[PDB]
Design a protein around this ligand. Structure first.
Ligand code: GSH
Ligand code: GSH
Ligand code: CL
Lengths: 208, 186
């Protein structure tokens, strides 16, 4: 295959990978996975990603990769001229700290809104977990504001892989009952991101 | 390097990587892990710390030079960070996401099922064998080792997972694992 194929769903974390591919100036083929019919849970998609999640990335040799953070580092690795990962190990580690925080904590908090059935069986448990999301996401936003976002981007002046990842997650905040406006650095960050060519490109492709 | 860790937690995976890289470090017992650099920079998140260790000791070969294999390694690491450790965390840290005692009982009761499902995925789709990438050790391996160590306690019988069993046996034989055991890290 000449180009990368990205399996994605609008409004999901898969969009972070699309943003990175756009920043890398690489051609790619987006494939929409339709949550409205639970396409991600069906045999055809499970043959692509047995975990039943987006994103998944199909490489030129048909290898399938999964996990947003891994795909972001992959894009950087195949497009070094985009400068998406700092050469300084400390700065790159701060970039990855932000990414793993999003993967392990902030996305996970968001996931308890609609995917409570991953960890519980009772309806009352789902209602309990759903009710806590505005508070858990606000606490995550607090940490982003104080300990992740140097400003304007995660690493400060320099855009990096942490930024598309953070952007897509922070895009969930209003919908999760958290005012992004209450966080000045997050607000400035979202304004810079919204103005970038990569983000305009994915919007034009119907991803946001 | 100063590493803040707690025995029997995921922070130990970082110590294992530092041992593999043959870097000197001062373990400080206490989230962990946290890594204090000489300029007093504090770095956090296991997966980020693992890549940091490989970045400062490139001759250790802890990350494949092939970007595909490196992405497969990181896929395993993010899976552990986002799914398997998370599933485990609902056993005793359910209060992160719920308030009602009935929700905690529900969560507790699912842990053997969620952890077994993760073990199934590890066995079939992460662990090529003997290590994550096959014959070649990588950053994914210390991460997987510490997480798989929780399986028995979470109600999952590892004996029924032959690749996980082989993997744990190979890890136990490594100098890095013997070293963190010698330091009381577990
Ligand atoms: N740890 C995974 C999370 C992937 C994930 O959960 N994606 C969501 C959308 S944001 C999904 O596919 N949900 C489908 C479902 O749970 O059925 C990653 O970072 O790639
Ligand atoms: N996303 C973090 C998770 C760190 C974490 O949760 N560590 C646990 C031990 S495995 C902890 O420190 N828990 C403290 C607490 O819950 O009180 C990472 O992978 O580094
Ligand atoms: Cl700066």
């Amino acid at each position: 295959m000449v180009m990368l194929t990205l399996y994605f769903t609008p409004g999901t974390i898969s969009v972070a990978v699309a943003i990175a591919i756009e920043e890398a100036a690489l051609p790619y083929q987006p494939v929409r996975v339709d949550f409205a019919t639970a396409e991600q849970t069906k045999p055809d998609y499970l043959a692509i990603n047995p975990k039943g999640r987006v994103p998944a990335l199909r490489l030129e040799d048909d290898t399938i990769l999964t996990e947003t953070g891994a795909l972001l580092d992959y894009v950087a690795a195949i497009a070094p001229k985009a400068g998406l990962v700092p050469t300084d190990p400390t700065a790159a580690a701060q970039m990855r700290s932000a990414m793993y925080y999003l993967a392990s904590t902030m996305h996970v908090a968001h996931a308890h809104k609609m995917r409570g059935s991953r960890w519980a069986k009772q309806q009352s448990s789902f209602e309990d977990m759903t009710a806590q999301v505005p508070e858990t996401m606000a606490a995550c936003a607090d940490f982003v504001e104080s300990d992740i976002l140097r400003g304007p981007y995660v690493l400060g002046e320099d855009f990096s892989l942490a930024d598309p990842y953070l952007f897509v997650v922070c895009n969930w905040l209003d919908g999760d009952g958290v005012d992004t406006a209450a966080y000045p650095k997050i607000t400035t960050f979202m304004q810079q991101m919204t103005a970038r060519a990569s983000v305009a490109a994915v919007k034009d492709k119907g991803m946001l």
